[PDB]
Amino acid sequence: ERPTFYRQELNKTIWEVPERYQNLSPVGSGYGSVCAAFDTKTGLRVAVKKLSRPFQSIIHAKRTYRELRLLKHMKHENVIGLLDVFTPARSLEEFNDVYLVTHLMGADLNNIVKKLTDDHVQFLIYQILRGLKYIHSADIIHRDLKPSNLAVNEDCELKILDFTRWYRAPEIMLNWMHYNQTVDIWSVGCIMAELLTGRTLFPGTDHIDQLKLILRLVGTPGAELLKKISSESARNYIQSLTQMPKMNFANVFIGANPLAVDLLEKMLVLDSDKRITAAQALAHAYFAQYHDPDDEPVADPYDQSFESRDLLIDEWKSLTYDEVISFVPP
Known part of the structure; x- marks a missing residue:
């Protein structure tokens, strides 16, 4: 009825x-x-x-x-x-x-600003990556993963909502075609680091500043990555910069569990062809107490073809009505 x-x-x-x-x-x-x-x-x-x-x-x-x-x-x-x-x-x-x-x-994860034990950092990040393994398996990229997008209950059971630029990947921030679902893995990098240290990893003032802060930690692009850049004026800009080396993360993340540091080096990679995926990150030694590969499930594939369609108001509206009507609760 x-x-x-x-x-x-x-x-x-x-x-x-x-x-x-x-x-x-x-x-x-x-x-x-x-x-x-x-x-x-x-x-x-x-x-x-x-x-x-x-x-x-x-x-x-x-x-x-x-x-x-x-x-x-x-x-x-x-x-x-x-x-x-x-x-x-x-x-x-x-x-x-x-x-x-x-x-x-x-709360969201901003509210959990005020510091977390390692066990608890593991639990929060593992839940994000489990959620992300699902989302990505359906060909959906979140794109703006950040603490305000991550809700936690009392018991710190975490949900991702909502599919600032302090957590945005630098290829997403700069309109670079060269991207991947692991743009979200960069955001997880910045989030886990902040859970570890209590402070924002890359609190840039504009996009230049941000990039400068990023390149200071991870290094200026090295020839291998330069070859992936097709704009000459982009390429000139990049190599006009004062060249920064890759800093040691152990000396930024002091006293952090060494597996956390290793993991952060795999997420905070400028080349997204080399960045660790959610699936791979779930298997990292660092989530040993929470990993179970037969309980980290994947999605039915998500049909986004509708995005390329030029339809009338009335047809988007009937299409919405159909989705309302056919909805079955959990």
Whole structure:
């Protein structure tokens, strides 16, 4: 059957939600407004996102669909999945609103700014890499992995949400075609380092500064990597720099578990053809207490062909309605 909905005004809008969701209290805005709610069916605290202006234009409509499609695909312990999706619309003609329901998450990893033991750093990073092994196995690159994108409960069980530039890979930061899923492995590098030391690894002021800080730690590109650069003016720029050598990570990460340091040298690599993958990082000696290769699962492959399509508003909208309708909860 259809649920019983109830209406009520908050965030200057009249929210219409199933009666199972109780006690809606706003928790932010700017895409759509979220409310914290109590789900009476499951006993869970949940976030209900009402999308704003979901079909106002073609870009709104396509993005509306891209969000719903993605969330529907993610079925993993360490990745934010979709608990429910609804509209008060009773047919496609009157379909103009969309609500997304996800697990209400406690802190993010910024909140865990204030220092972590090695065992706990292992546990947090291992969960990110497990989540990332899944995500990447479906051909999805997160692209903006950072502490504010990583939610943890009380027990520090970690989920990745949301698929600053302090954690962005330098090839993603610089518009370099030469990239890979391991752009996310760079972000994990910067995150693990900060968990280890208590400070941001590369707190640049602009993109130049950032790059300068990066190259100071990892070294200026060496001939092998220079050969992978097709722009001459890019190549000239790079070799016009004052040449920096690769610093020893042991002397940046003082007293850190030596396996953590070794691992950080494998992530914080400028050439992404050489950067360690999530799958490989899970097998690093450093996660010995948490690694189990028959419980680090992969994804069904994710169809993104829709991204190349030039469709009308109404067709992105019907396409979204189909995804709403066919949704089966966990």
